[PDB]
Scaffold this active site. Structure first.
Site, PDB file in Angstrom:
ATOM      1  CD  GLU A 279      44.189  43.889  28.436  1.00 48.25           C
ATOM      2  OE1 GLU A 279      45.382  44.263  28.353  1.00 48.25           O
ATOM      3  OE2 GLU A 279      43.838  42.823  28.996  1.00 48.25           O
TER       4      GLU A 279
ATOM      5  CE  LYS B  35      47.694  45.379  37.835  1.00 48.70           C
ATOM      6  NZ  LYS B  35      47.481  43.948  38.226  1.00 48.70           N
TER       7      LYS B  35
ATOM      8  CG  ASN C 251      49.830  42.088  40.425  1.00 47.42           C
ATOM      9  OD1 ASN C 251      49.433  43.174  40.004  1.00 47.42           O
ATOM     10  ND2 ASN C 251      49.205  40.949  40.167  1.00 47.42           N
TER      11      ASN C 251
ATOM     12  CE1 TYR D 234      42.492  44.743  36.798  1.00 49.51           C
ATOM     13  CE2 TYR D 234      43.053  42.832  35.449  1.00 49.51           C
ATOM     14  CZ  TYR D 234      43.445  43.902  36.239  1.00 49.51           C
ATOM     15  OH  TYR D 234      44.787  44.132  36.470  1.00 49.51           O
TER      16      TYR D 234
ATOM     17  CG  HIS E 271      47.095  44.490  32.902  1.00 51.16           C
ATOM     18  ND1 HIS E 271      46.447  43.275  33.005  1.00 51.16           N
ATOM     19  CD2 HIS E 271      46.942  44.887  31.614  1.00 51.16           C
ATOM     20  CE1 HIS E 271      45.916  42.963  31.838  1.00 51.16           C
ATOM     21  NE2 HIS E 271      46.205  43.921  30.976  1.00 51.16           N
TER      22      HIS E 271
HETATM   23  C1  LIG Z   1      44.016  35.203  40.979  1.00 53.82           C
HETATM   24  C2  LIG Z   1      43.781  36.564  41.595  1.00 53.82           C
HETATM   25  C3  LIG Z   1      43.962  37.733  40.857  1.00 53.82           C
HETATM   26  N1  LIG Z   1      43.750  38.923  41.446  1.00 53.82           N
HETATM   27  C4  LIG Z   1      43.943  40.159  40.680  1.00 53.82           C
HETATM   28  C5  LIG Z   1      45.433  40.464  40.545  1.00 53.82           C
HETATM   29  C6  LIG Z   1      45.734  40.171  39.088  1.00 53.82           C
HETATM   30  O1  LIG Z   1      46.771  40.998  38.553  1.00 53.82           O
HETATM   31  C7  LIG Z   1      44.400  40.404  38.398  1.00 53.82           C
HETATM   32  C8  LIG Z   1      44.246  39.539  37.154  1.00 53.82           C
HETATM   33  O2  LIG Z   1      44.410  38.191  37.587  1.00 53.82           O
HETATM   34  P1  LIG Z   1      45.300  37.148  36.744  1.00 53.82           P
HETATM   35  O3  LIG Z   1      44.797  37.095  35.316  1.00 53.82           O
HETATM   36  O4  LIG Z   1      45.333  35.895  37.593  1.00 53.82           O
HETATM   37  O5  LIG Z   1      46.762  37.851  36.853  1.00 53.82           O
HETATM   38  P2  LIG Z   1      47.611  38.465  35.613  1.00 53.82           P
HETATM   39  O6  LIG Z   1      47.456  39.976  35.706  1.00 53.82           O
HETATM   40  O7  LIG Z   1      48.991  37.941  35.946  1.00 53.82           O
HETATM   41  O8  LIG Z   1      47.010  37.869  34.366  1.00 53.82           O
HETATM   42  O9  LIG Z   1      43.407  40.039  39.363  1.00 53.82           O
HETATM   43  C9  LIG Z   1      43.331  39.010  42.797  1.00 53.82           C
HETATM   44  O10 LIG Z   1      43.132  40.132  43.321  1.00 53.82           O
HETATM   45  N2  LIG Z   1      43.145  37.906  43.527  1.00 53.82           N
HETATM   46  C10 LIG Z   1      43.344  36.691  43.011  1.00 53.82           C
HETATM   47  O11 LIG Z   1      43.162  35.679  43.723  1.00 53.82           O
END
Ligand SMILES: Cc1cn([C@H]2C[C@H](O)[C@@H](COP(=O)(O)OP(=O)(O)O)O2)c(=O)[nH]c1=O
Ligand SMILES: Cc1cn([C@H]2C[C@H](O)[C@@H](COP(=O)(O)OP(=O)(O)O)O2)c(=O)[nH]c1=O
Ligand SMILES: Cc1cn([C@H]2C[C@H](O)[C@@H](COP(=O)(O)OP(=O)(O)O)O2)c(=O)[nH]c1=O
Ligand SMILES: Cc1cn([C@H]2C[C@H](O)[C@@H](COP(=O)(O)OP(=O)(O)O)O2)c(=O)[nH]c1=O
Ligand SMILES: Cc1cn([C@H]2C[C@H](O)[C@@H](COP(=O)(O)OP(=O)(O)O)O2)c(=O)[nH]c1=O
Ligand SMILES: Cc1cn([C@H]2C[C@H](O)[C@@H](COP(=O)(O)OP(=O)(O)O)O2)c(=O)[nH]c1=O
Ligand SMILES: [Mg+2]
Ligand SMILES: [Mg+2]
Ligand SMILES: [Mg+2]
Ligand SMILES: [Mg+2]
Ligand SMILES: [Mg+2]
Ligand SMILES: [Mg+2]
Lengths: 132, 130, 132, 132, 132, 130
Positions: E124, E10, E110, E51, E113
């Site tokens: 994906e 990211k 974060n 997404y 992905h």
């Molecule tokens: C839950 C949540 C996710 N996100 C974003 C960051 C996550 O990496 C992405 C997908 O959500 P999620 O599926 O909760 O995370 P992961 O990638 O661990 O499966 O959406 C937000 O911006 N705000 C939020 O409150």
């Protein structure tokens, strides 16, 4: 003095899992990836073009063979004085502190290519990234 | 293909830098061929190893330190191993080398590497008679 | 034997998160922290004093503005031959293996300052640590 | 307080150049080397003894053939709670943060062996270091 | 159990120069790059598709905005139990030992992905690498 | 946004692990807000810092060690800083954390991090009255 330069990450890097190590050193000197390709096996024509300057040396066929014996990554990097600096970074198998200096020990298997001049850079970028 | 003799000195153990040192030699693609751990080395072996230095002021302090803690003797092997591992060892002035990055003393300098084909053959013999 | 030298971690190190990286390199070479101060913003006259030998240069103002553009840390390191050894460690953006050689690529934003002599060391220490 | 435990660096660590990486992790947690031996090839019966509690399993032969497929290093580490602490360090290929969790991805080629109890520790030490 | 899995690196990774760090951790667990793309700015359609599951959550637009605010790398990785293991590697911002656990501190920003299931992976991979 | 108090303990200086520790907190994107180097800390401050422990067997050895060498007190800041830096600190059993990777003792464990909003506010006050 902002420049782009062409970097190849060679098959030995993949063999020895040094790919991220090599890229990390360039990243930490603050150069940016402008474009990037992963080749599971590079088209032999590309390799022949890339090392054209060498088509005559006795090491030409072995070199092509090796450059094609595994994956490579071609990367265009950008930053102040990029060509010269990524070259120092590349270095040579004799002097520590560099990619080659720290991780390579062969005249053929040396992990990385970096353009060495303003012309070779333009050239090499068009070979791997013809779309400009 | 070449072989060379490396000593990890007691300061390396004192300072918890043993893996860091070996790791640097490992990353340049050199391979361990024989290795011994000496919890404390016989002064005999040290004086042999440093026999060419038997006439210097620093000679006795050198040996004193060399028996002040553990050492590891390693035989490494790779293309041009003797001079490359020597360049890797470096000195306390040149950053990028092992001593240059990690050592700050003329005596306690973490590592020994053979400096020639003759030195290597002789040092190897000392540490690995077998 | 023992010397003390003055080091500054410049604002770019904070922006780029290389504070620990820089300090680690000085730590791994066996130098010790005698004093240390964190400045969220260094007072300008401290910067100006610290660079006073530089006041007539064209770059003087921009340098000072940069040095005031973020946090800095002032550190007094102690070790054998510390002034010279930490200087080499800092190196320059042309010399792989050093701090600036691996991590910096700029004439002004070069991460770290190290005293370059016995006199500048004594002088610079009294500036950042006048309480002695 | 003090315990001693037996560690093996397996052949895959040599093939993949992770010997220093593995040993470094045990070193950074403050455990000390008491004894250590490098085996370019471990004698098979040593391997078989070392894994004797395993002789009836289906995997027993392949395991032994693997353990004999390259160099290994046997090490006796000493430290507080060494047996248990070095076991957690080894971890497993499912647990990020541990040796196998970060570097291994295989049921058999998992880089490192660590004694799992006081008795196996005492037993395994006497196998690789019978001279005591 | 050999699998391929889709990884996105990211924009925050590029901002903070953690790209090679992130890739290095996956490399060191012995997974291989099967294909790879660098996007200086990802086509917003790709991000929306990627997404899709989230098209309804209140964080959907901010997320797309962020995913498009800088470069990303899409990577197809291969190895034993790849989907599950690269997921553990990814981790979460709470538990150390992982990419997110060690280097991220935001619910949105974060770094990485990784597909979380056999289906999301097929999906994906076709989004970013339609050529199969 | 939150603030928390971190102490780098004397064993960290003894073992040359100061940058390694701070570096781990730096990599998780937490920012230094105030920092002080104590070559040796006033026993007063320590006993305050560890006042909740004034009734334990380990209390005096704790303080003894805490004044046995330098310490650095740092105020960090970032989202959810108190519990995240606490999770980062970990314990000598859990690899991946600072203590889990680098510490092996119940007393000499390299680092202190505030464990709650109250502890933080109080510890910060102790180390940074200003
Ligand atoms: C839950 C949540 C996710 N996100 C974003 C960051 C996550 O990496 C992405 C997908 O959500 P999620 O599926 O909760 O995370 P992961 O990638 O661990 O499966 O959406 C937000 O911006 N705000 C939020 O409150
Ligand atoms: C000189 C030489 C080069 N090569 C290969 C490895 C080199 O990376 C490549 C180009 O040679 P060269 O231009 O000498 O190296 P550099 O990449 O440092 O400019 O050719 C050999 O295989 N054998 C040789 O003897
Ligand atoms: C010159 C010198 C060496 N020595 C020690 C450290 C050296 O590792 C060893 C051999 O010295 P020397 O051959 O000068 O260094 P190197 O190890 O690089 O070959 O003797 C001293 O203790 N004091 C000294 O003044
Ligand atoms: C030479 C030069 C230095 N500087 C800044 C960055 C340098 O770190 C600082 C001191 O200059 P200088 O003494 O040349 O470098 P250093 O002492 O750090 O080795 O001044 C500029 O901003 N522009 C310039 O042209
Ligand atoms: C369970 C198992 C182990 N092994 C090998 C790898 C293990 O390191 C070794 C000992 O098995 P085990 O005790 O399960 O793992 P460890 O003691 O190393 O935690 O046997 C196999 O080859 N196949 C298997 O199915
Ligand atoms: C439990 C315990 C703690 N201590 C010391 C080390 C701890 O860092 C400090 C506070 O103890 P504790 O709150 O148990 O640990 P933490 O630091 O994780 O909060 O007291 C001892 O010296 N001996 C002991 O038996
Ligand atoms: Mg050339
Ligand atoms: Mg010599
Ligand atoms: Mg100067
Ligand atoms: Mg077991
Ligand atoms: Mg999900
Ligand atoms: Mg507590």
């Amino acid at each position: 003095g902002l420049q782009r330069t062409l970097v190849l990450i060679k098959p030995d890097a993949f063999e020895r899992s040094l790919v991220a190590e090599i890229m990390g050193r360039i990243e930490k000197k603050n150069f940016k990836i402008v474009s990037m390709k992963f080749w599971s096996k590079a088209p032999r024509n590309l390799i022949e073009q890339h090392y054209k300057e060498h088509s005559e040396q006795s090491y030409f066929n072995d070199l092509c063979d090796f450059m094609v014996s595994g994956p490579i990554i071609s990367i265009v990097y950008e930053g102040t004085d990029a060509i010269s600096k990524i070259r120092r970074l590349q270095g040579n198998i004799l002097t520590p502190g560099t990619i080659r200096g720290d991780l390579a020990n062969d005249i053929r298997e040396n992990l990385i290519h970096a353009s060495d001049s303003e012309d070779s850079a333009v050239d090499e970028i068009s070979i791997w990234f013809p779309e400009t």
